[PDB]
Amino acid sequence: MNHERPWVFLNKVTGKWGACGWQPFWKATSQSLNYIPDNFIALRTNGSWVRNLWQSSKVLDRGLNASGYPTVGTTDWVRIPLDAPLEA
Amino acid sequence: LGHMRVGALWQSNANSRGLPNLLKEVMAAEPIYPYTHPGLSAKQILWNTKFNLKLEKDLISIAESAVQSQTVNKVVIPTMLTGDVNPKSPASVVAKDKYQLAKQMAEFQYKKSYFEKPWGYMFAYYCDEDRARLCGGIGYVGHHGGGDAEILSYTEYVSTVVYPTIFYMAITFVVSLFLMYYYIYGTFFSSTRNRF
Amino acid sequence: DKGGFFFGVGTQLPRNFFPKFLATTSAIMGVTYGLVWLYNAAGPRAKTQTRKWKELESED
Amino acid sequence: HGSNLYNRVHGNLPQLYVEQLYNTDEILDTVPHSSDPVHHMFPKCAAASPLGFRPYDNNKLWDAFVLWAIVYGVTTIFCVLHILKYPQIWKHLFETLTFQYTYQREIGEEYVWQYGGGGLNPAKWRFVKSPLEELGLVTEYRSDLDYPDDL
Amino acid sequence: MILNTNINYGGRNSRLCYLIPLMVHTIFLYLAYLIYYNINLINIYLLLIIIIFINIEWPLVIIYEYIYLTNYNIQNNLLYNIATFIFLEILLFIGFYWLYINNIIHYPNNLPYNNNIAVNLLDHLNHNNNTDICLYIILHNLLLLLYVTLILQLVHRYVQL
Amino acid sequence: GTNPGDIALNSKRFTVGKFVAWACGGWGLKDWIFPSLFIGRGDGPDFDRIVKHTLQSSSAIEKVNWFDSPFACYTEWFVEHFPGFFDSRYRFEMSAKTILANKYPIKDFPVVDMRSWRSSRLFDLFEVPHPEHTFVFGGPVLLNTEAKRAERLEQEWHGKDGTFVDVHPLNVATESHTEVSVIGGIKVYNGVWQGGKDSWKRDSAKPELTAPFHSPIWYRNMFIVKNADQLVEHFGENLSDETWQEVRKEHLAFHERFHKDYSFA
Amino acid sequence: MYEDEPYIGVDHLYEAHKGSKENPVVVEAIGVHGNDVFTGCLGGCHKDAADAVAYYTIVPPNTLAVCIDCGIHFVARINEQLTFWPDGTQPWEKVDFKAVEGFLYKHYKYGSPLMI
Amino acid sequence: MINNIMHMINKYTLTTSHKIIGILYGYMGYIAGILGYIISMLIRMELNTQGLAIVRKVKEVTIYNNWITIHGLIMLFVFIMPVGIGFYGNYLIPMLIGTSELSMPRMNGISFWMLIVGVVIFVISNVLMSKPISSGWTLYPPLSTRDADNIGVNIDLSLLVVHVLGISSTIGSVNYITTNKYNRHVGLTFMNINIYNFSIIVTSILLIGSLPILGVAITGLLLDRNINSTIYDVIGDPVLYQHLFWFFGHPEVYVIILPVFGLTSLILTSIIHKDIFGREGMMYCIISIGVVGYFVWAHHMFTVGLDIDSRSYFSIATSIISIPTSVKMFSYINTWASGRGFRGNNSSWSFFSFLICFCFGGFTGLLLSSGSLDIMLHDTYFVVGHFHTVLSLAATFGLLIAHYFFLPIIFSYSIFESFSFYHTFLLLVGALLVFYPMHLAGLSGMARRVPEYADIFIPFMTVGFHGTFLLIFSTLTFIRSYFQFLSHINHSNYL
Ligand code: HEA
Ligand code: HEA
Ligand SMILES: CCCCCCCCCCCCCCCCCC(=O)OC[C@H](COP(=O)([O-])OCC[N+](C)(C)C)OC(=O)CCCCCCCCCCCCCCCCC
């Protein structure tokens, strides 16, 4: 399995943000004793995106100029990656 | 033959998992010398290590020469019971006068601030982490226990739970005996009704 | 909160598991009772179990 | 688990592993070594659980067949042999379960029905007609099936 | 140099885990076949040769394990097992004696002949006398077995001392 | 938990695996027609819960060395399933650092893992599935073999006198000691070399090679073993009972905002 | 009869008990180097600890462990039972460190068979 | 590859390892249990329907008799002893006393493969040969020996199967006793061993003493059939056969039940986080039940014409054996109190059902103990209700406790609790609907071992029909749950 790392949707008109990502699921059955689930939302990463989101929350909520990021389809939403902390 | 191992150095297997290095687990990717040698750079640490190493060599040489070339004026042979491998330790760990009490109180205050509360918080984290490891459908966390559990001592439990239960059981026993005998036979002491 | 309506995950039960369990088991028992009634009302019988026979036999 | 022959031969008493040149199974018929790997009970589960996987995947035909044989193989073999040896018994079972065999049933009769309460008590029983014939699904009862005469 | 494990006999894999069961199966099917067709599928001498050959494995493994794997814990286990086996044999004999004496302790019996007194000179000892049981030879065999028991006990103690 | 493997080949509506499960067990038409009841939410990471637990955290999330540790691959599991994970982890790491910055020469660190749990039944101490061969090198060793035996009862069982069990001849001899020292012109005899049990102190600690001789630093990992069925802990000299009760109260008071918004139903 | 026996002297009021952080309970098992040691209590080393049955423990070797049920510090440790190959070639008189040095070097570097 | 195939076969055929032999015993036991359950479903379908719906002839009722006899034998000797004793006895006994293997390692493999040859002979005789044995699991002569429908060699092969099963059990018993006596780690006294070990020891002592007598009885049957002797014919004593058989018979049932008590106690200690209440009392009660069981055998023979004083004695002895079982039940009830047993655990709820059903079965069997009252209850469905609410509702649920406990430990995967709850609840309800009515059917006068009953007994069999449908549902759920246990996910997508 390999999907996109979690991102942040940001609405420019209303300045309304929120994290998002692909979360897999599967039919529930017995678990495994010798296995602690790895990082399935941000695959092959040490899970730093939580820290990056925590640090970027103050900036995003304060207000950010989203003209420098790609749009989503034809709507007023833009994607901000969480591969690195956001400082602007 | 496949991938035969070369040598017999330690490998983490089912029979052995080794002794964890908590210091490296916690201080991962962070230096330790800012805490053990505050304010010193690598060159200063190395220079200090060299100086102290030479000094220790000199002191060790002096001490060995002294102990190995001193005349014996007295011989001290401690008293022990027969069949005993080693003499009893003459050191006591209990304060005797008030000055020792004050000294041990100061030591206890320091240890509490600097060695005991850290242990307590580490253990609390370990317990919560074990809960998290067993959570999520892997194990039986949350099936019983919790902080709302009512824990009673042996005396309290036996006095307030066991004896009343047996009392109720005895009363139920007598009442059921009488009611069942009446129900079947229709009398209390005369066997079947309208027959005898 | 995960898993299905009737099943949970591993060793965790779904929310309100026991009322759902009782309701579903009651439904299963009802269906089985219906099957028994059907097999008795349409399966093999004997001429001695008819209403006329049984009612004439009961009296004396 | 990989073999340990290098360590065994280079170890401390190599003369004990000379037999390994002959027809020998290392896991079963060789002197254990202090550095040998730890052998687990069910290697398939022991290797699959730490990865998060169950031993058998239903997509693979080999895995599906192996698991079926483990769980259902012997019971189905027994049932098949029983069916071959006693074909009439299963025929009778199929006839009865599908309302084809009715011992002495008749059209329009009412038959006794009582769930519990002990033996037949005329103060508890009811009488029931056949819903199959009330719905028009059945109008005659077969007479060419096996019949227990002299019962 | 070798690494010493626990005193317990670890155990070896062996073919005796299935050979003895297969031997029992062979014997019982041989009996069934002899019952059905009244003839032997395989010659009885050949069958006994197979049975003997299968069981020669016990003394060999016994020798090579005593030479190498033995101590007092193992010896105690073996002796206790021997005792339990002797107990099982005693119980088997008890069961067969129960079988024998069931109709003999119960004195009354319906007999084809007369056993009342004052009708013939010998009738009064018909039921209480099976006068053909080879008593003299039985006593001779008893003497032989007493010889064996006493001699064996004497020799055992003598070597043990 | 579970590792789904390849999500792609199991999402298809018709699959050999689904048909085999239908035939033998684990799947049926109830899942094809009513997935919302028999599949429903399924089992997997809860992104919304991870975000909530992340944003509820304090600045401890910034100051923790977790993301560089070997357990960083479990960040999402512990963020989701351990409310208040980052604050507790920060307290744990600061506790370790303050033990490290002590004035004592030996820094003792408590270690707790899957082996830290005692049990009355031996099969509970092995990893699952159990190894093929267990207790090859003998069974457990009881600590009680190092306690003085019941001498009085032992003598009494045998019908021995045992009157003077507590009266022993004194022994003052040079022949009874192997450890001899010369301390300021005094030849002190004291102790006998016993073997492996006399070197427990050095074999348990590891030195800091850069620390000078006049200010030694030793690191010791103290293992912890508990029953988990006791409900009361007695750490001994490492932690007093009053301090432990204080820590319990403070821990339950701080880690309450992370726990109050959830029900256990 | 044991619970009402007296202490011998007033030492127990002053000394450090057996099982202190400085006077631990050291125990020795046999096995392979580095293998975790199986040890245990018979129960009830403390008033608040269970005593119905023996309680077992799996602990790393040559490390200071603390039982926080009773509060006792212990030093389970392993000694390997390396012995001469018993085939009749064992030595009948005092042996020196050379041949033993070779055998020990080989055992440490590669390992040796088990007497099973 | 030939090497890999031979390695697997040799791994499972040359083995002398207690864990491997334990899992083999468990697998064979579960398979035999499923086969017996299928045969029982055929029996129930024969009973549930009027007019000989399945056999269709009075001349062909020998098929029904074969069904009952093979059901009894399969379920007793091949299902519950290989699972209760063979599976957990080999797997755990060395582990709990801290040793490597059982003493006499080879005899363990010999025992398992003796069981296998017994199963093979039994299945081939009763499935692939015509007119099998039709005399109930108690092979009473002269029905077994002098009967038109019992002349083939299938009967003799079945008797030899009984012999081989006895041999296997004796070997296992001797091995267990010897290993427990001498192979305990230092510091573990004999009476401080785990309670399961003591129950296994007493079961082994029971088997050793009684099996040779059964061997003698079965050899008597074989000789009557083949050598044409009159051991049990009109000039013989069928009562002698019954005495020998039942001298083996009751120790067998206590052998079946005691290991379930040991397992339940062990698992309780594990899942309630508290020690057994009165461990010494429970162990002493176990040994007392074991010893007392050797003096009561003839309570199965109150109607054959015993002496009146012997009838009185056997009723007295049965009451004596009743006492310690009550002590054990009280100990369990007090053990569960003040514990922290998991509240969503199939093991916990199976323990509840085990306790309740065993108390009910014990009371019903205590009614049968009285000789006089056994005049009205011998060879009725009251006895079937008794030994099915004991065997099929208490011993079975003890094995379910063990199953839902030890699976995560043997395989390392958790248990689907909701699925297992469906299985256990439906098994409980379905069984109670089949067996409970039998009691009131026995009092009313219905006889056992009959395929066709009078019209007075309709309601009991209608309730039995309901119960049989529920049982089919439950056992299908069980087998499907186990298949799902070892299978990876089958659906997965993105949310
Ligand atoms: C251990 C022994 C055992 C077990 C388990 C059972 C299980 C069952 N038995 Fe029976 N039975 C006997 C021992 C047993 N029986 C004996 C000795 C006789 C007398 C024979 C004689 O009279 O000659 C007898 C006779 C007997 C009769 C006689 C009918 C007649 O005489 O008129 C009937 C019919 O109602 C019956 C029904 C059942 C049913 C419906 C089940 C079960 O379907 C109900 C419970 C079902 C279960 C689910 C158990 C099966 C378990 C598996 C699925 C294996 C999986 C493993 C575990 C769950 C751990 N049994
Ligand atoms: C494992 C199975 C098992 C167990 C545990 C038992 C246990 C008992 N059994 Fe039975 N039994 C069988 C399996 C079992 N049995 C089988 C298979 C048959 C049929 C064989 C055949 O005929 O085919 C059979 C047949 C059988 C009969 C034959 C009836 C008949 O054939 O005429 C009798 C009658 O004496 C009997 C009695 C008992 C008694 C008295 C107990 C006692 O152990 C029960 C004692 C338990 C208690 C009493 C419960 C505890 C009670 C209390 C909590 C306190 C109450 C105390 C007082 C009021 C004093 N059993
Ligand atoms: C139809 C009635 C129940 C029939 C089943 C009886 C089980 C028979 C024993 C054999 C078990 C076989 C397998 C069982 C499978 C599952 C059975 C089952 O349904 O179990 C769940 C049933 C029903 O449980 P429940 O309905 O109470 O669950 C609600 C509880 N929480 C809050 C967790 C959601 O089990 C029991 O209730 C047994 C324990 C009784 C204790 C009652 C406490 C009440 C709950 C707390 C509420 C708040 C306080 C109220 C004050 C108290 C006054 C009453």
Ligand SMILES: [Cu+2]
């Ligand atoms: Cu009985």
Ligand SMILES: [Zn+2]
């Ligand atoms: Zn302790």
